[model samples]
Every structure is written in C-alpha cells, then in structure tokens.
Target: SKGEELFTGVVPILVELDGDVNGHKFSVRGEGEGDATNGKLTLKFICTTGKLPVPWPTLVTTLVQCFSRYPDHMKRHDFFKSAMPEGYVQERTISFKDDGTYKTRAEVKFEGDTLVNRIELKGIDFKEDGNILGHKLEYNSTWGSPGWVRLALCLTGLVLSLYALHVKAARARDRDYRALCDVGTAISCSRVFSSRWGRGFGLVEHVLGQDSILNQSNSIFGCIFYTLQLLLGCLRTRWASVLMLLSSLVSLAGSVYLAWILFFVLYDFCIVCITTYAINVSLMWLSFRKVQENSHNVYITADKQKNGIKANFKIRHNVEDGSVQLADHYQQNTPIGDGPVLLPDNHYLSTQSVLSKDPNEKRDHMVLLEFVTAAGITHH
Candidate 1:
C-alpha cells in the first residue's frame, strides 16, 4: 500500500527513455503527490531487451484527483509534450512502418502548464519466425524569431493596398479619385489608374477574359498579396518566410515595372502608387534581411575582430577656445585631467532648448541628456 496523509508539497516530472538489451521484459513507473506552483521538470529513460516482443509494448498513465475539502487544490498536468515549438502544448500522435524490415514505431506528445507525460515505442522481434518491425518519428514545429515587426509591416501594406484599391475603384466609377492621390498634372493618379497597363499581365486578361471577374485590377491583387504576407508572418515558419521572400520579390519587380510605365509611358506619377512601391521595396529588404539572419551556417565576424582591425576615436574639448576636436588614435591613453568636467557656461547647456516647440524634440533632448548624464556630465 502507498503511504497516506502526505504533507503539503510540490512535485513536477518529465521522462524519456530508449535502449536495447537481452529479452527480459522491464517496466517503468512513476508517481507524484502534492502541489506544484510555477514549476518545470524533465526526466529521461532508455532501455533495450532482447525478449520483449516484435515492436515492443509501451504504456503511459496520468491521474488527477480532487478532494472535497481542498477546493482550491486542483491538479494540472500535460501528458505529452507539444509537437509545436511555441511552448504551448498541442497533443498529437504519429506512426510509421517499414514493410521490408517489418519495423514500426509510434509517438505521442502533449503540453501542460502544471504537469505532462509522454510515451513512444520502436523495436524489432527476435523470434525465429517473427518479422522485424520499427519506425521513426520526427516533429516539425514553427520556425523563426517572434517577427512582430514583420507582421506590422504586412498589416500596414495590407491597409495601404486596400486603400489604393478603393482609389482605383473610384476612378473606375468616374468618381473623384483625384482627391486621394492626384496633386497636380505632375502627379496624377487618374493617368496611372486608368491606364491599360495598370491592371495586370496581358496573358491574365486573355486567359480570363477582360470582363471576367478573375481579371481583377493590380490593386486587388496587391490587397490579396499583402493579406498572404500578413498570414505568413503570423505563422512564422521557414517555409512561410520563404514564401514571403518570394512574394516580396515579385512585388518589388511589379513595382519597378509600374514605375517605369509611370515615368516613361504616362509621363506622370501617382502618390498612392509610389507609396505602395516604397512598401514593396521595404518588405523585400526586410524579408531578405530575415533570410540572411536565419541562415544557420553563415558567419559574420564582429567589426573589431575582422582582419584584426580595430577603430578608436578620441574627443578633446577645449574650455578656453570653446571648441571640440575629434581624432583617431590606436593606442589606449590614461585618463586626462579628471575626464574633462562639464563647464558651467558650456554653450550646449546655455543655449535655448532644442525641444522648445516639439514633443519629439523634447524626447530627443531627454535621450541626449540621459546619455551625457550617464557619462558623468553636468549642467550649469
């Protein structure tokens, strides 16, 4: 019988096992009693027996009990680790079998905030007539950094694309589309929006028929593309990023083509189109940067370590002349005269506040002040 009336406590556990040996069967068991608060635990086990069976048998058990007197003491546990890499538990089962070798394997994983357990099996039979059996299991999870910045950019692009489509629709309806992006003859939205080249590829028009619903305007396509980018950013997988990179490249190419038509063919520009082009370029750059940053084998040496090169700068302030000078020096030097104290009459501090009229300017001033203050500078 198990012991009873245990004292107040907390216990957390996680276990994994794998191995092979003689045929004697072995069993693994685990038990926990008490309370666990904000805890993480892991356990691992490995074993192999020559005599168990063809494709061994594995058992996993989890239990949660409630006591009437302890209403607040509820048990929580995750029976399997989440296959997803985001740390949130998602339960899933995977199985595999090889016909030639007669091998098979199965895996189950789960996630939990308080407790979790998992079981997996893979093996071969050793009997004279028994066939070999086993399988392999792998987990594919979401990949990349928490690219919220990428998501924000995609959202912005989506909004801009939708608005541009709105302007285009107004132009189609003969409404005042000019009020949105037409500044003058030099920058005319109508000229670009009403152009035949502004819609899409000639092939698309031919295949779908110019009047067909499938032959939507470029702005409509842009809206859809941006929406896809936003969704891919949310997914944040390697494949998702790859798709985003390709989409952004396509967008950049389309922007370049339209820009050429705007300047050469129409001899005009659209503010809305230019803004969309800028977004495409920016998205392309960001996606490219992300791809470069995520390349596992790429190595970039630190600036100071590359080619054994080092850069140093020295600043000297002259109190008498009220002049500041900057020079490059390779060698380190001893501190000079108490590290150049801030003068009471320094022009920077005495001058009218650079932040006099703007909130952003005031923030900039505060940032500068923080930097100088941290460096032991003082005001009059």
Candidate 2:
C-alpha cells in the first residue's frame, strides 16, 4: 500500500475561509502521512481544535516558495482550542500540485453531514518538493554549542548587571530605596548596598588608592565581565577556548569570594547578587565543557606480555583534522622529534622500521631512507 516516503511532524497550518465562517491560523501538529501511490493524506490532529470547516476540494497549487527549507530550527508553536476535532478523510481532494503533487488540500469539518463548511488549506510543505510556511520556531537545539548559548548567557548577565545598576542609582538618588525583592526590614537591599564594603569591595577603597578608576561599582565589574566573555568566547581556537575558560574560572572565584561576603558581612539577601553568582558558575561550567570538548581523547597503556617485556605505544586519531599519530614512546601533546609524514592514497607503508632491518647503509641513527606508504594491512 506504500510506494514512497512519508514526512510527519508538528505543522503550523494556515486556514483560509470561503466567506461564511471566521478564518484563523491554527497551531496544529499531527502524524501526516502521504505517499506517491496513496494520493490522500491522513492527518490525525493530536488534540484537535474547535469544530472548524473544510477547504475547497479538488484543486491545484503553484507553490511560490517563500520558506523552502529543511525546518532545522523547529520548535513547538502554541495552539488554540477553537478548531475541528480528529476525524477521518474530511473528504480528501484528489488534486494535483502546480509542481505536480496530488491532494493539495484537506477539509476538516464537524461530522454530521450537516456543517459543510469546506475550508481550503494552502499547502505550505512537501517532502520531495515541500516548503511549508513555518512560524517563528526557536531552535532550542539548532543554534547548539557556542553561539546562541553564549549569546543567551551574555544577555542574561548584562540584564542582571543592568538591573543592579538601576538599584544602585535608585538608592543613591533617595535614601528610602525599596527594591522589588527588598521585601522586609532584615532582608533589605538598601542596607546591603549602602554598607561600607558595598563600594569598591571595601578593601579596594583602602588599597593603593580609594575612589580610583580601578575601583568602580560591582555592577560595572559585571558589565565588563559579561562583555569580555561575549567577545572572547567568540574565539573558537584551542588556546582561545582555554583563555575564556580561565576567565570564567576566575569570575567563579570572584563569585565564591563575594558570596561569602553576602552571607557574613552584607547579611541581608541580595537577590541580584545571588542570581549573578549562579550565572557566573554556569558560565564557568559552560567554558569548562567548551575547553573539554576541544581536548583529544588520548590513551597510552603499556602492558607486559608473557615474556615480561613492556611495550608502550600511542595511537591518537583526530576526528577534526582526519589525521593519526603513532608513537613508540609516550609523545607529548606536541610531537617532539617525529613529525607528520603524509602519504598518497595508493602508496605502500610497512612496519619495516620496527620489524625489518635497513637494506640501506646503516639504521642505528635517524635517517630518511625511503618514503614508506601504507600498504594492505592484514588482520587475522
């Protein structure tokens, strides 16, 4: 009963009325199955909307593709409870595509043989030639690794610092400073912000110089911290990654040190302070993982055979560069003496250096004899 492939996923549908009923767009998802042989489509509306109407049956389409993509950044689009319920074959139209596709429209109606409000569905997608008009779907996965997450953390910390600056500004303008989270007398943000240690971390004010440019508001420090991470985290190199990770680690240290001050000195709860602390630690972990991801999983284990002979060998394969490193001694991260010796596809390489004797003059010292290429490797 099947002749081709089927595409089924959450679909955001556009419904156009033929003038009697109210027209509205629907956030609908169903198991949409359509094959070449079976021209009809069975869409089981999982949690169907209100009693909606059907579309113009038996029609054709010319798909001037506005959005013809693979739906990479797909996410859940919220729906309404005002559409038709799940029903069979709302009278599947045997229509053809302007790009040569059958069943371009599906009519969903209230089953009674009464409400004949045939609604026309503008086909938005196709498998071989489908390009469904999708609403704004947040990736949540598409923009993985570094971009979206780094941007998200950057914006979050910026806002957090921005709010803190607003609080400091509001407090300095008026003594009767009451923040949103400044709930009670004991849990007051004014006392927490107005304390002696509040400005320049207290110790900084008494250090080399007080009221200096180096000693600024804690919010200023946060603004700089996030802005730097956002800029530097954009660097995708190995050393650059560790650099950002190092910064993140140092910021985490700052968080821990300031966290203790909040508990003992400030005493009162600073809601903004704790949130930034959490964000700090989170950024640290994110950087740590980023650096960790750059690391090549290298394993070199020396095992003694039955003759009590120790053999140490290192086999490192890099998936990124498509290169392999082999060494007798445990080589450093950067190869010491040995270097990469590339070979052509049809070349022959043998273990003659380890097993066979040099047919040349002498083999005691390091000397370039002949270019050894990879030959057929026999595995018994």
Candidate 3:
C-alpha cells in the first residue's frame, strides 16, 4: 500500500466555532485525501452528533455527490454500509472545509456583507496547472437550487401553453358554428311562430303547415349547433382550447336561440344568455391565468439559476468572522462547460472542464452531484 499512489488518507481533529444545531453544540474537524486512478477519498472525523446515528445519511449523500463530481475524488462512489454506513437524503446540504476537510457550517453573503450561515460541503480543488482537482466538498443545500422545482415549473408551463392554444382555437371554431346554428334557429322560429300568429287571424294555409315547419326548422338548427360543439370538444389537443371553443359555441347558440324564442315561443331567453356569457367570461379568465403561470415559472427558474451562481461568489464574505475568501466569482465556482458526447441520444458524458477551441471559454461542468445535509435532505 506504500507505493499504491495513496488512493485515500484521512485525519480528524476538533474545531471550535460559535455555532449550535438546534441547541446541540459540538465541533470536530475531518481531513480527506484522494487520488485520480480509481477515484476514492477517505474521510475521518470526530463529532458529537456522529454518536447519535442521526446525521449519518446526511454525511453519506454529501460525500458521494461531492466525490463523484470531482475526478480525483471518485469515478463512482457506492458508499455501502461497510464503506459509508451514513447515507444522506439526496440533494441536501452538507458542510466541508478547504484542505479536503469537512465542515459543520459555512458563512454566506449577499453583496458586501456576510448574511447567514449555510450548509455546504467543500469539494473540488483548483490546481496550479489550471486543472481542477477534488480537494474539498460542500453541499450548497439551500432553497436557491432545486432541480425538481425547476422541472415542475417547466412541465407546468408546457402543459398550460398547450392547453391555452387548444382553448383559443376551439373557441374560434365554436363561435363560428354557433352563428351558423342561430341562422337555422331563425328559420325554424319564423315557420312556427309566424304561421301560428297568421293562423289565429284565420290564415288556414299557415295553420296547416305550422307544426311541420317548426319541427324541420328546430331539428336542422339543433343538429348543426350540437355537431359543432362535439367537434370543438373532441378535436381539441388541449383542454383549455377545447373549453374555450365550447364556450364560444354555447354563447352563439344562446344568442340566436334567444332571438328566435322571444319572438316565436313567447318566452324570455334571459337565463340562456346569462349562462352563455358567464361561461365565455370564465373560459377567458382561466386561459389568461394559465398563460401567466407558465411564463412566471420559467422566468423564476432562469432568475434563480443566475442568482445561485452569483450568490456562490458572495459566500466567502459571509463566512463566520471573515471579510471574504475568493477574489472573484468566476475564480472559485465557474459554470461547468460541456461538450458533445457520443451517446444514444446525443447525450454528453459530462466533464468538469470542457475541451474547447476558445481559450477563454474553459469551464467546470457538474453532471450530477448528490449531497446529504444536516437538514435531512440530499442535493443533486
């Protein structure tokens, strides 16, 4: 094992800090070292909470994500019980320090001043040759970077957009069909009501033909309007679209029915008109809300990503009793750059630093990093 390139080495020490987790106060230091060939790191630490067996999972997930993301740490970290009994909730926060050591907490800042304490692990080290190596790991376990939340927003937007377009198109067709149906209703009303009045005045021909004319007219108008509604609902690719179209058709039908019935049937069509208008208004409002929700989620995700990266830079200043650490944002945590990888779906096997023709475009790409934090959540 002496000449085996020292795949991993560990040292644990005690640390003193003004901090407490839910009034449980303790401090310890851990040191870890790893190599590039097989990609493994050994971490040794002494802590008060470690004795309770509660924070084990948080420690494990953070370690795996931190190590796997960095090449020199581990190619793949399968922390078995025999290996790392402590497994963490995926994509949670964990703390670590520089020099390949783990930390209990970290200080963070907004702009110029340190703001709050955060749970993060220190992983990945930048070497003199400009190649980033795995020296430390940290879990930036915060509300600012959640993948599922992002995915949810995206899915929501997609669904709403589809539904909105569907509703818009459906309504247009429905409106047109309803107009056509009304024309038929007018003809039917004329045959029934017009002939009835004429008959009461002793028009014999009108009386004989009244019932037949009304039947034919109503049947034709009803069938046309009903068919239009069916087509709008069934042909819709999105729910909102279908609803919109249906509302329009219903409105048109109501309008025409009112006109024909008021004159012929001696009945007011107030209820029909009111219901149609309400439906139309409701559909329009729903469509608008869907659009707004979709757009808002998208903008939120983009803004969060931007803010997360920016916030990473300000973290140094926020460290406990420290003015700042990193000189610049890009210097410490730069966005991982990626390149085209040959995969089944053109998927790129991510690398920390992307190979590029542009000398200034080098970046550290994070494919997947899972970290368990003291808060009982794993971050990926």
Candidate 4:
C-alpha cells in the first residue's frame, strides 16, 4: 500500500499551487500517485491540535482559498462555488509523467477505493514544505479579489454562537450542569457560563442600571454580534462601509476582554467560547478588508439630508484609479446634503423632506430613516 489510512477511511483531495511562478501563472494538478505520506504529517498536526468548531477535516481547505492564487492562468474560469478549495483549481488533467496510465481521455479513471490525487508532488517538496513551516507565505488569496471566505467565516461564527447560547442556557437552569463541553474541571463551559461576569459582560451593570441590554448573557451578545455581521456583510450597499467595521471593532475587543475573563478571571477553558472569539477576530480583519475594497477616501454621512439638499448625485468606483468618485452628471451639476444620493454599489432615495415658505411646502426635514431605503425605484 502506497498510503496508510490513519484512524479511518480514504481521503480524496486535490491541490494546485498557482501564483507568480515567473510572471505567468503556473499550476500542477495531481494526476496519479503523489506522496501523501509527506503531507499527512502536516495535516495530522493541524487537525488534531485542538477542539473542532465545525469540521477539523476542512479547516485547511478554507485557509487555502485565502491565498488569492489565481491571476491570468491558462484556465481562468470562476471556480464552481466550493470546488477549488476541495479540488484545488485544476481542470481535471493527468500528470505528464504518468499520462500514459490515464490516457483514456484523461478523465475517466477515478478509483472509488483510494484516490491518489490526495496530494501533489510536482510543485511541492521537502524544501517548499520547510518554507511553509517557516511561515514565509505572507499574502492572502481573497485580498481585494472579492471571495466568499469572509461570508463563510461569519457563518461559522453564527453557528458557534448558537452552541454557546445552548450551553449557557443549560448552565443557568441548574447550578451543577454537566454540559457536553464540560470535559473536566479545568476545561468546562458550564462553569464559565454560570460565573459572575456571565451577564452584562461582567461590567455592564454599574453605570447603566443592572438591567441594561449590554447586561444580557455573553452568549446572547455573541449571537447578536455575528448576526449583525452577516446582515452588514450581506449588504451590497454603502452601509457596509465603515458601519460594518464600527460594530466589528467592539466585538473584537469584546472577545479580547472575554478571553482574559475566560482564562484569568474564570480559570477555565470553553471550546465554544474561544472558537467564536477566533471567528470575531477574523471577521474584524475581513471587515476592514471589505471596507478598503469597496470604498476609499472617507467621511460619508447623511447629515446634509436634513437641509433639503436634493440635488441628485451618483457615486461610483473607478477601476482605473481605485477611488469612488462623483459621476459625470454630478460633476457637471453640484452636490451636498443627501436627498436622492447615489452610493458605490447602489443608489438610495427617499430623504427627509422639509417645509417651505409657502404653506403647501410641507415635508419632513430630519430624515430619521425608519429603515434603509433601497433603490427599487431608480430616479431618471
């Protein structure tokens, strides 16, 4: 046997190392018989390191997509959703060294028993592996390219938050709860959940009364944090700009404070708690990346909307020089104070109307948005 099934059954995977290989993109897809033994050691170390939030099997796969490898590759096609990180972005071709073995159209043979494409030996070697151990790779795959890694991360956070909430509720009902996460005295979720600072962040009580919203259970905060991130993250509008980061900063700091409480204050380890902390920290980074990616040159506000400044303006992202600028029509006209203003991804209408000198000129001045008015109806 060329490979040993460590603790289980077969594993099928493909990895293509693509990027600045002397300007033009280079790729090496697994054909047949790559040394999985070499890769196995590294993978085993990563998976068995600690607790599993979702699946330990696919964590490396998601991290791989963060590399932003594709540029002008020979097969520059949009990856079919989650195919690449699993298959690693090669058009199912055979290795030239063993092309003869798979010459039957180069695609027909895939062993359901043991997949040899689990690892590739061409682009990677002990030398390259050493660099990975050295942590020489400093770039991310989704940087400015616009991928769904951030979205997937938030989903993980959202899911983990629910689990945290479940354990939290369980611990509250009974003082000595034996949660599934309560592995031992040192590693316990219930102990941490039922602690003094569990509600209101351990500090939200004194200043704003004991019943402040901030004084809710920590798990509730986690659920709220990730849910807001998802909604803001999903927004294809201007609100996703700094608004996303504004919330994200506090969550990152929240996790930092809670982490201290988890280790030092409580002297315990909650797997679910730490997982969400990791998620929030990662989301914070992604939030900043998104902000920078979508818009540049700051200070966008709706303050002028109160003054009836309905002049009509359209703002767009310029590819030639990465900046969002006023459109040609607006450049020719004039600008200021909200009312029917265009945004980077979409346009926004319906501002607070004001009254005029004439009695018939009655309208709402301060545009307190009941909700974000969308661009369903485009203004000509």
Candidate 5:
C-alpha cells in the first residue's frame, strides 16, 4: 500500500515537474518564534543524459496523448507513427530535485499537433550545470525547396478548373436533352391530326376525334418524358441557382397548361392554333418577367459581354429533337483566342422542298437572297 501510494504521488510530481527549471526544496522547521530544531530534505533525481535515440512508438504514444483532440489524430490510431515532414524532429529531458523545482528541455516534433518523433536527453547533473536554469534547447529544421509550394498551387488550380469544366459540360448536355424532348413533343402533337393515322385508330372523318389507342402509346409516354426533361433542366444546379421565384410561378402555369392538354386531348387538336398561341404567350410573359427580375439592363449587358458583338445577328438554338445547331458565321472575322466566340445554328431545308425542288435548278436559284436575309437560316 505504501509503495503504491508513493509511486502514485511521485509519478504525478514528476509529471508536474516536466517543465520546471529550479530544483525542488522540501523543508520542515519548528513553528515557535525560537526555533528548537529544523530539518530539510535536499534531494535531486538526475537523469542519464546524452543523445538518446528515443523509441518511435514511445514518441508516437506521447504525441497521440498530447494531441488527442485533433480530428485527424482521432480518426487515425497510428497517426504520429508515420514518417514526419522533412523539416522537424523532437527531443526532451526531465530534471527533478527536492526544492519542488525541475527543468525540461523537449525537442517537440509536430505537424500542427500531430507529433512524429522525439529525442530524450536525460540525466543531466544539476550541480555541474553552467547556467542551465534559463537554457533553451534549439533543434534545426530542414525543409525542401520552394518549388513544391508552386507545384501544389498549380495542381489545386488544375483540379478546380477540371471540375468546373465537367460541370459546364453536364449543363450543356442537359440543355441539349431538353431541346430534343421539346421537339419530339411538337412532332407528336402535329401527328395527332393526321387523317390516315387517325382514321385507322377509329377517328371520326370530320373531327380529329379522341383516340385511346394514341393515349395508350406515345401520347402519355411522350408527355411524361418531355415534362421530366424540362423539370430536370430546371432542377439543374446552375439553372436552379440562377432561376428566380417567379420562374417557379411560371413553371406552375406551364404545368397547369400541360394538365389541361392532357385532360382535354379530344378538343386540343381542334383548337390547336389557339392553344399553341396561348402557350407561347405564357412563355413570353414568363421570360419577360424573368428578365425584369434579373434587372433587364444588367442582364442584357452581361449577355452582350458573354455572347460578344455578333450575339444579336448570330442565331444559336438547340432543337427540341436532341440536336444542336448554331449559326454564328458573322463572328468568324474575330480572331481565334481573342475573346469569347459564339457558334452558329445549323440550317436545314424543309423535307417538302427537298422532294419538290427540280434537280436541274441549283439551290442558289431557289434560295432568294432577300428571303435568306429575312429568315437568315432555318435549323432543326
């Protein structure tokens, strides 16, 4: 029991005296004014000192205990057991005496609270000291060349750039998909009024009549697919961030319009012109509101900057059939790498014209210069 208590008390005292410099002094003196007898315990525990190559595990254990609060250390059990950064090393010594004062010189090696190794220089004779009271041991740190920092910065920049490029490509793909879905929907709408197809599906000779057969097939499927595509485009990270609350309101209106189309399919083709007109009107109104919300002047300025001078004349649009067509030939005069360059939309003649036009007549005769100037080019 005595041994255990003594060891416990001594261990704490030693730990407390880790950084103490002055030797400990324990004295017992008579309490009366005239001292009858006095005794003192003058003791010192000198450690065996020199360059001790401390065990790696011992240093690692000490560090782990010291920096237990560090998140990296908490995750990694053997965090400090690994190879240390080039510029660091550690050493330590413990000096204890009866005067309750002791000294410690620790060469602490760490990378922000993660200790790697330590050197223990112990057992220095205090009496033989040459002004060791205020001694501060210094350890040399060697680091690699400055080139690594530059390389690290460059690598980080490259990674960020690649990530941004990937995101842009993804957005572009989404826009393309949305346009394709839209075109497919438009084609499906056009085909609903066809006489040959309609008659075969039990349609009245007079009216474009309701057809459940159509509903069972592409009608429902097409609407659902197209709606999802539009929603996906709207939900995209970049698009969502830029979209306003008003955009949601507009989208709600779009949804209502689509719902009406779904419920009133029989009458939709009969009133196709009116329905199409109303939908276009709603879209234009929504676009206008959005432009206003974004501050039309600022938005225009930004668009001009982004698209360059030829943005007005150069037509560019993604077709609703999952095709990309650009028509920015006017901006070709601008030098490569000078600034941003807008691509042109693709142009295609109608299928009817291709079939009807005489082979003897060159396209130049059929393509009127004035008509070309007015329409510029038609792309699908």
Candidate 6:
C-alpha cells in the first residue's frame, strides 16, 4: 500500500491493490479451475483507455506485477513509517463524485482447487488523478549561498596572487622600485616574496623532486588551483563537491603555515599575502559546511522477475557548446506483465562523459604562460 501511494500521481489510474486471500497452490490444465494442490494464480486487469503520462503505461504495469506476488499478510504495511515516523499525522480525504459511473474492473482466476477470498481494488478515477509525472528530477547541486561566497573569494585571491607574483619579480630585479604592496621595512612585500619557500610551486617540488617539469611559479599553481575549483563546482556532483572541499582544506593549511612564517619567523607582513590567507580560511569553512550538508538518501524498488531494478538520472552536456543541458530524462528496465518494458534511453552521465570533449581543453595554454611571463618581466 505504501509503495502504491508513493508513486500515486504518476500512475494514479491503476495503483496497487492488496488484501488477505484464502487459497491453495494448484495447477490448471486449461482456462478452468481444477481440483488439485500446488498451483499458481492469475489476475487480469482491464481499464478504459485515454491520454496518460509518458511513464504511466509501463509504471502501472510494473506496479500490478509487484502487487500480484506481494505476500498477503503484508497488505497493511506502512511504507512511509520508517522514512519519517513520529512527527506526522495519518489522514485520508474523500470527495463526492458528481457523475455516478464505474470506469475500471479486475478479474482474478485461481489455478486449482484453491479459491481466492476478499479481493480489493485501489485504482482511482481518471478525474481524481493529478498530473505530476514525466518531469525532470532536479538536484540542488550548486553550492548554496556559502559556496558562492567562497567561489568569489577564490577568484579574488587568484588575481591578487598573480599581481603579487609580478611585484616579487619587480623588486628582485630593481631594489629601488616601490610596488603598491610595499609600504616600508615592517610591511615589506619584497621580503616575503623573496623568501626561499615562497617563489616556486610547493606541491610539485616536494612530490616530484625540485627538478620536475611540473614545478612552476607558486602564483601559477594558485591560478591552476582556482581554475580547478571553478571547474569542479560547475559539474555539481557528489564526488566533485568532495574534491573541491578537500582542495579548500589544503589551501587553508598552506595559508596557516605561511601566516606563521610571515608573522613569527620573518617578523614582517605582506598585505596581499595576509588577505589571501584570510580568504583561504573562509573558503575552508564554507567548503566544510557544503560537505556536511551533502548527505542524501536513495530509495530502492524491488522487482521479482528481474534480478533487480536500477534507476539513473543524470545531467547531459551539449557537445556543440560547453554548457550543461539538463536533459529531463531517465532510463529503466522493469518487468511489467509478460515482457520487460524499457523507458527512454539517451545521453547518461558517466565518468566518460565528464572526460570526453572537455570544454576546458580549448583554452590556449601557451598564451596564458606568455602573459604571466610578460607580466613578471615587464614589472622587473
């Protein structure tokens, strides 16, 4: 009954029916009932044909098979009881029908000597059915308000870090040059930028040796990290969100370490570096909250004929353009009556989809490198 009610609006015309029936197992030689034990039962449903939702025909048929094989004693099972129990009230509403007419009926036949008792029908009238099916199930994957704020901070930090890198090279070449970040001896941007630990990329140098090809300027690494965060946020999947959260965590740790070096070790402060550190801490907090609120519950339906049922809903991307297209679609292989019914099969989201024809690949890497190098050289 709960399963029947769970998918009410989609196939309201032919919902599930259940009741206690006293019958014995028997076999039938022909259409008529015979006197024997150890058999099977058959149920035939007929309804008035009319316009229905896209998935109603298959969904209704599958539901009928589900009810037919259901255990008799479990008729009064509370399906929604476990999902949410204490804080809700159970109530039923009925309306008076203006026209008195019967629309549908069910005929049940037993195989052998056993006769069924107490048959019930749970199908609703066509007029009473509400149209709430055949729509896309949208998930709120966009990092909420906090996530957007963190995204802005990352963008800001990237720009400031790039400028700071130029300032580092400028002062290194000409000691007389006064950058905006350079105030005096106490607030010296040149001192922090010229430090041994601040110039080259930290992760690449440590992981792949200092001579690794991946090793580049720390400013370049910061640009790459921010770009990755933006890309991950766009995908809006569970794993992508998790990775973004981890990236923010690493940035936070690096910021704290650098802050200690700037204040205690160097005994000097750089305004740009300190501002980026504050942004990193805020981004970390926001990302942590996103991970905490990412818990989700998936409901499963049982199909006796098939091994099991698998339902996958995914966002489709347009290959022509780089934009993501939410292709309001789903695919399912459910056993209905005598045969298996297949729903629409189209572009489904997978790891391959994300990796293939990436829009990010179209960017000119040489141009970006030349631009950064020119900025550093011209400032020097």
**Candidate whose TM-score is highest:** 6
Cα lDDT of candidate 6 equals: 0.40
Model 2 lDDT at residue 11: 27
List model 2 lDDT by residue over 269-343, tens digit each: 777778888888888987786665523222221121211111122222111111111211221111111222111
lDDT assessment of candidate 2: 0.40
What TM-score does prediction 2 earn? 0.42
| lDDT of every model, 2 decimals | 0.39, 0.40, 0.28, 0.40, 0.25, 0.40
Model 1: per-residue Cα lDDT at residue 326: 21
Q: What's the candidate order when arranged by decreasing TM-score?
A: 6, 2, 4, 1, 3, 5
lDDT of 5 by residue, 122-168 (tens): 32344333222222111111222213322333244333334333433
Q: Candidate 1: where are CA atoms >4 Å away?
A: 1-148, 175-177, 201-203, 206-214, 298-380
Model 3, span 128-190: residue lDDT tens: 222112212122221121123223333443333343334334444654323211235333222
Candidate 6 Cα outliers beyond 4 Å, as residue runs: 1-148, 200-209, 298-380
TM-score of each: 0.40, 0.42, 0.21, 0.40, 0.15, 0.44
lDDT of 6 by residue, 200-297 (tens): 63456667888876666666777877777666655546687689789898888878888888888888877888888887777677567556542311
Report how far off residue 12 is in candidate 4 (Å).
Answer: 60
Residue-wise lDDT of candidate 4 within 12-39, one digit each (tens)?
A: 4332322221122223232112222222
Q: What digit string (tens of lDDT, one per residue) describes model 1 on residues 228-288?
A: 8766655534587688899899888788888888888888867677888887887898678
Model 6: weakest 10-residue lDDT segment is 366-375
